[PDB]
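Researcher: Batch entry, complex prediction.
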Amino acid sequence: MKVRAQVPTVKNATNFNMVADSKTSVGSTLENLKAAIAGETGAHAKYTAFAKAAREQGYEQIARLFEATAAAELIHIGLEYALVAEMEPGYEKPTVAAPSAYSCDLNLISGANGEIYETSDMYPAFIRKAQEEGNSKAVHVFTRAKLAESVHAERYLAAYNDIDAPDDDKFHLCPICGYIHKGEDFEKCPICFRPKDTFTAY
Amino acid sequence: MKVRAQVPTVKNATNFNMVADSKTSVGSTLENLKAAIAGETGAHAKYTAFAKAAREQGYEQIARLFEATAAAELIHIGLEYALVAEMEPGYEKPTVAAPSAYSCDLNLISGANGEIYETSDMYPAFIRKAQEEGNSKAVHVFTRAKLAESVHAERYLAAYNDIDAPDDDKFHLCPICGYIHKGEDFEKCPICFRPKDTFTAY
Ligand SMILES: [Fe+2]
Ligand SMILES: [Fe+2]
Ligand SMILES: [Fe+2]
Ligand SMILES: [Fe+2]
Ligand SMILES: [Fe+2]
Ligand SMILES: [Fe+2]
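Model: Structure tokens for the complex:
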């Protein structure tokens, strides 16, 4: 993802349209934030399991990508939980069991498919509902997660295409939005402009 | 996609697995070749429509990507048609009507999803059946298409992430397998080793 002159938002970007045949149940923004957290929690468990399998399967770099992406979803959970807690103080984050893992290549595809659903269906739907209800904070959180998921999708497809051609690049994770960069060739996060110095390498 | 010491095949690559819950009806290799051609023909019509819509929407570079990918599918049709013609000289390639094109970002997602289905479901299923029936010619053709589709998927996701950050890079199409590269930084096709100077620029 290239760095634009300005931070991408639903207002200045053109990849925020939602699929017509949605597979997303849309309720109040509160309900949507909870649904997103549940999905994020499932994603974290999924990627954690995929990383474990990747290591057993002999793909150390891909394992690191799954670990970095799992960490990215934890960041999304933190952003969404902070808002939900404010909207419903006693709210308790859900626990999701580790899903089934398959061969590394298939796990990368499974990951990409989920990321695509979130960036083109779920989050855009939630963003528009938040706008409708005037919840600017939710719009911001959903936007950041949405942008990060499409980056995750691309990273997974790149890894799939080069599954037998790994390298020693590290994956740099932005602590603010979950953006992930492969390699050192970058200065800041293209999603939130966070300087590279505060990123964490995987 | 990185260039390896040798061209990728089902014999030396590890991303040829078929998703366990397949959405693909598998018949004889002859039937599968015809089914693949039908899908390729539909993809060509879809990308052609998407390209036209992209230009109307002001996305010149994305339009070029859709045009290059449409051309790539025609290459796949050629490879598959040649094999069918050998067993059934009377076989005629089908023609399909053009589908609707929506907003550019969603068209890129539709493209990516189709590419992912082909590379991780349909082609792996067809390749495996061809192997079980000892049809090496079909294994070869299905492999080339399969490898190109995952590259298409990545190119589409990359364009989606940078939908508002286009550049003047040309897309280079390999005339032999449909591989597509963005920019000039490459020496040969990572799928079939065709030299860069033989590619067609879009
Ligand atoms: Fe996420
Ligand atoms: Fe993600
Ligand atoms: Fe960021
Ligand atoms: Fe194709
Ligand atoms: Fe394709
Ligand atoms: Fe090629």
